[PDB]
Ligand SMILES: [O-]
C-alpha cells in the first residue's frame with residue numbers, strides 16, 4: 168500500500184489500486200438535512216461501553232487508533248438501525264490543517280474541524296477480517312468535533328500524542344473511557360456505506376450523531392503536531408487526513424429524530 172493524503176497519493180488517486188473507490192455505496196457523504204427522512208421505525212441506539220477495555224494507542228501513518236479488547240462482548244453497539252451485536256475494535260479521528268475542514272461527513276455542505284469514528288464489527292462473523300467482507304459487517308459511530316470549549320474526556324488522548332509522534336509508534340493506553348467522547352444527545356442519521364480508507368470495502372452501517380462535541384483549539388492543535396512519516400524521516404504533519412464526500416447514488420439517509 169502507498170495511499171495517503173498527500174500531494175500525489177490522496178483520495179483522488181485511490182481508485183487506481185482500489186477501484187471500489189468509484190462504487191455505489193462509498194463513504195463519506197454530504198447529509199442534506201432536508202432530504203433525510205425521519206424513520207419512526209428506527210430505535211434508540213444502545214451504546215454499551217461500561218465494561219470497555221482500552222489497550223493501546225497506535226500511530227498507523229494515517230491517523231492514531233485507540234485500540235480495545237474485542238475478544239469478548241465488553242464495549243458493544245446495538246439497536247438503532249442494527250440487528251445483532253457489534254464489538255468496538257478501535258476509534259480514531261479525521262482532522263484538518265485549519266478548523267474549517269477535517270470532517271469526512273458534512274451537513275448541508277458544512278465541514279467540521281474533525282470527526283471521530285468508533286468502529287465496531289458484527290460478532291456474527293467472528294472476526295474483523297470476516298466482517299469487512301459483508302454488507303452488514305461494520306457499524307461506525309461518527310461524531311463531529313467543533314472548536315470551542317475543551318472536551319475533558321479528550322485530554323488523556325491529547326496528552327499521550329507526543330509519545331506516538333511518528334508512524335509505527337504505539338503506547339500503552341489502558342483505562343480510557345470512551346463514554347467521555349460522546350455528546351449529550353444520541354439523535355442520529357444513518358445510511359449504508361463503506362470504509363473511508365483503502366480498501367474502501369462496502370461493509371459499513373454509518374450512524375452519524377447530529378450533535379457535535381466541543382473540543383478546544385489547543386486540543387485540536389495537538390492532533391496537528393503528529394506526523395504521517397516515520398521516525399527521523401522528513402517531517403510531514405498529520406493534517407487533512409479526511410476523504411471528501413462521495414456521491415450518494417441510490418441511497419437513502421434516515422434520521423432517528425423528527
Ligand atoms: O476512516
Ligand SMILES: [Zn+2]
Pocket residue numbers: 259260261284363
Ligand atoms: Zn475513520
